[PDB]
Symmetry: D2
Subunit: 115 residues, 4 copies
Amino acid sequence: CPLMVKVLDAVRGSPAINVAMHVFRKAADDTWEPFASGKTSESGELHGLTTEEEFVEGIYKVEIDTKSYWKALGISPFHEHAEVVFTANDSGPRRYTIAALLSPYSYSTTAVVTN
Amino acid sequence: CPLMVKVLDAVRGSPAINVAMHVFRKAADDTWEPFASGKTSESGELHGLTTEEEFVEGIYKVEIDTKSYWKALGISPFHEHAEVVFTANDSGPRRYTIAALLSPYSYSTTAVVTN
Amino acid sequence: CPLMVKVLDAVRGSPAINVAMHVFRKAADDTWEPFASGKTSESGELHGLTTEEEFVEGIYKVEIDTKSYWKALGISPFHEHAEVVFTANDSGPRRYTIAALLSPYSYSTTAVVTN
Amino acid sequence: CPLMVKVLDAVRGSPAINVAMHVFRKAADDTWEPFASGKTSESGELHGLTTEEEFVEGIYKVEIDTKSYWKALGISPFHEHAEVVFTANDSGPRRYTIAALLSPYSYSTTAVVTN
Ligand SMILES: CCc1oc2c(F)ccc(F)c2c1C(=O)c1cc(I)c(O)c(I)c1
Ligand SMILES: CCc1oc2c(F)ccc(F)c2c1C(=O)c1cc(I)c(O)c(I)c1
């Protein structure tokens, strides 16, 4: 599993379940092409987005639909989505965990990259 | 000043100085049109981006060039940029501070929205 | 003002107002003796805690009463308080801002140390 | 496993390995009594601190030795340690994950609490 996303809720102290996200990859003409999508499970994790062979070098964007998550809890949040943009596999294959910790007016994001 | 951006450095414990950013407004065709830009001051702040009359309701994106900031310090970063995407909404007189706290492999962002 | 504390609310997107805190200095017997205290202003800031002559090198603890803050808003919090423990070190003229960003089940803290 | 701690490094984008921590429990006389201790593994996780039977209701403090972690990487950090203080099991047994994301001048901490 070369790309995994984990989302947590800082209001409830829980995984953020059923959070939709779309992953894009920058094409040679500089447009964002669709790459993969899914939603977080009961553990707040989304696995199985891609494979080692498909996940080539490139610039990737993870767009996490945080607005819909908060609205369903009755909260009108500040952000439209959380966006994570990064170059992947520039020095050979790596495994990436993208994580986001969500509050209505704030989020933190980090990456855990392993060889 | 209806919109201000403040950027801090979590490695050095300091304002993040000379950080470039662009602000975009989402257009009717879902493209991002440039709206304002600048570099943070010695206090890590960027003022004077817009005026009350120009800053109408809509979806805005602040793209902060965090990669160039870390490269200037000789530190390898994860993100291509930090992206803050939000809806501006008219409910009473409001001033928006977008703040970002930067680390090489992580960032936190919040909004301080006041009257 | 050699020491200032700023507290923000990540649920409401606002300064955290009327947040009580105590500052302690570590004594020779490893106990915490009271040093200063106050409540945050409408800007979420607490100024005037100490003076340059009083704020000598040593280990200091800021204990922020985040539990009472969340209880006043009717939101169940995780932490008893937020604790920030640091060493003050003399290397040139330095001013310390301790900042805390609060959510019910999470907090972030940073230091902005300037000349 | 009713109490687990996970520590990540926001500079390197990696687990924080070999981070020492001590857990204390508030006694009836209001002193902090030693409860458990350990260090994080190669995954940045510390498991096996306690058992369901030993982990009774109370106020617990996790003291994470972040200063030694940074010093061994050549970094002189701001904080002496990260302190996480919380009431546990007040409504019956729960499983707690305490997490900390570390930078030299900043850290974020959250909790994931499950029934
Ligand atoms: C994401 C940016 C951020 O991180 C924080 C944190 F981790 C703890 C406390 C904080 F206030 C913040 C903070 C801020 O928004 C911020 C900091 C200062 I100094 C300000 O003067 C203003 I206005 C805003
Ligand atoms: C931005 C997301 C985030 O915030 C953190 C924080 F504030 C403190 C400590 C942290 F580990 C994190 C964290 C994580 O990356 C994370 C949390 C868990 I639980 C995991 O199992 C995995 I894999 C990753």
